[PDB]
Amino acid sequence: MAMVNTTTRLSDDALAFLSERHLAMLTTLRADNSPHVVAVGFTFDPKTHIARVITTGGSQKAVNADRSGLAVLSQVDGARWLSLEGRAAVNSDIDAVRDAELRYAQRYRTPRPNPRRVVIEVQIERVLGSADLLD
């Protein structure tokens, strides 16, 4: 396990795994507090500890992120895995959307246009994962 805050740095191996191309699951909570888990891409900025998901505004995952205010982003590749937990909010500012799209293209590829795109921003505070990555 590791805490994440202004004084922390994830291990080099964990950061590498986060920069490599991997798909993930986004977990949020529904209004009844049941977990909502859906496949996404995401990006993680080690300088700010902000994880981003681009998605459609008003989509279920966006509604939950906004309403309950928390999210987890989780990826696995065999023995390596990580879950990044934190506080979440939805940003619909078009310049923030563009910044998110540019970040997404680095990890994945240029995304298809989406006039209703928003960003879920997650301020990562705790990480779970495989023992070799943590540190």
Ligand X SMILES: C[C@H](OP(=O)(O)OC[C@@H](O)[C@@H](O)[C@@H](O)Cn1c2nc(=O)[nH]c(=O)c-2cc2ccc(O)cc21)C(=O)N[C@@H](CCC(=O)N[C@@H](CCC(=O)N[C@@H](CCC(=O)O)C(=O)O)C(=O)O)C(=O)O
Q: Which of residues 45-74 bind Cl ion (CB under 5 A)?
A: 54-55
Asked if residue 90 lies in contact with residue 66, where contact means CB atoms within 8 angstroms, the answer is yes
CB of 34 to ligand X, least distance (A): 11
Q: Does residue 81 touch its own copies according to CB under 8 A?
A: yes
Task: Provide the residue type at 17 as one letter.
Answer: F
Burial of 81 (0-12, 13-18, 19+ CB in 10 A): middle
Count of chain residues binding its own copies (CB under 8 A): 22
What is the b/e burial string over 12-32, where b = at least 16 CB atoms within 10 angstroms of the residue's CB? eebeebbeeebebebbbbeee
Residue closer to its own copies, measured from CB, 33 or 95: 33
Q: Does residue 86 touch ligand X according to CB under 6 A?
A: no
CA neighbours closer than 13 Å in the CB half-sphere of residue 75: 20
Q: Does residue 53 touch its own copies according to CB under 8 A?
A: no
Q: Which of residues 103-122 bind ligand X (CB under 6 A)?
A: none
Task: Enumerate binding residues for ligand X (CB under 6 A).
Answer: 1, 23, 30-31, 36, 38-41, 53-56, 58-61, 63, 76, 79, 81, 128, 130
